[PDB]
């Protein structure tokens, strides 16, 4: 199922809910052990991890260094070692069972820093920084390479993307997206890097484009019916699900589904309540 963790709806949230695209109904599971929005989620070894973010509450606004692990058949969260720095609006990707935490902000500071988590060792290690400071960055893994896409450097929103090579431990700028996107949904469907929605500094976007590594080309595809940034994104049985977000006026509960064979989007569900800035993964 599609798990959604955290989010924001007048305050950061502890929610963990799971959607079943076949049956169409929502499970309510154990609450996070610190309310978080702007976090990222991934799955390693069937375990669901919640990385970074912040607790924006009536009483504070603390950026998060936490990594927390949910066990789907224990329905219980347990803490893992923290990161070197807090990373609000972080991006994460999974290569070879290891979690990469990318970018994000701590207060005024927009990180270019990147670090790696070792599940069976529960250790973080600092690795080569990005060429670019990026928060609200989308991250994706293709051919065991790590891509950092778009985001916001503190001044400009970005259409640039760069690529991290784990065996060189090095970055490389690649071709820029056609659209400036911060807070987009970035994932890997079929064999392209998809970038859906986001915010270009003026409007939330409903456009969607995908990167083909072999031709180093971004192409536009079917756009979503609703503009959104700070959305959750995941692919389930070969189709893209985008989850909540913000359109400049309301917090979306709309969940859209992109069919790559028809190049069409359709609304399949509404989340239990509108929210933005969630961590999403499937397990």
């Amino acid at each position: 199922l599609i798990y959604t963790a955290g989010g924001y709806f007048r305050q950061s949230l502890s929610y963990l809910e799971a959607y079943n695209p076949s049956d169409g109904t929502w499970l309510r599971l154990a609450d996070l052990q610190v309310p978080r929005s702007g976090l990222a989620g991934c799955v390693v070894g069937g375990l669901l991890y919640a990385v970074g973010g912040r607790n924006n509450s009536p009483d504070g606004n603390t950026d998060s260094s936490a990594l927390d692990c949910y066990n789907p058949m224990t329905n219980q969260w347990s803490p893992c070692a923290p990161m070197s720095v807090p990373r609000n609006r972080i991006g994460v990707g999974v290569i070879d069972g290891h979690i990469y935490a990318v970018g994000g902000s701590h207060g005024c500071i927009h990180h270019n820093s990147v670090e790696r988590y070792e599940p069976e060792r529960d250790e973080w290690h600092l690795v080569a920084p990005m060429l670019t400071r990026r928060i609200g960055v989308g991250v994706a893994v293709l051919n065991r390479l790590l891509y950092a896409v778009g985001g916001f450097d503190g001044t400009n929103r970005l259409n640039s993307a760069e690529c991290y090579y784990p065996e060189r431990n090095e970055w490389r700028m690649i071709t820029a997206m056609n659209t400036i996107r911060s807070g987009a949904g970035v994932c890997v469907l079929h064999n392209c890097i998809y970038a859906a929605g986001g915010y270009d500094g003026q409007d939330q976007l409903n456009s969607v484009e995908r990167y083909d590594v072999e031709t180093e080309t971004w192409t536009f595809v079917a756009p979503m019916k609703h503009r959104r940034s700070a959305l959750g994104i995941t692919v389930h049985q070969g189709r893209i699900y985008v989850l909540g977000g913000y359109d400049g006026h309301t917090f979306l509960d709309s969940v859209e589904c992109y069919d790559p064979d028809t190049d069409t989007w359709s609304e399949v569900t509404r989340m239990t309540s509108g929210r933005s800035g969630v961590g999403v993964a499937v397990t």
């Binding site: 950061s12 702007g38 911060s182 807070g183 933005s276």
Partner: peptide, 6 residues
Amino acid sequence: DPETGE
């Protein structure tokens, strides 16, 4: 803020 509503 325009991006996260947060």
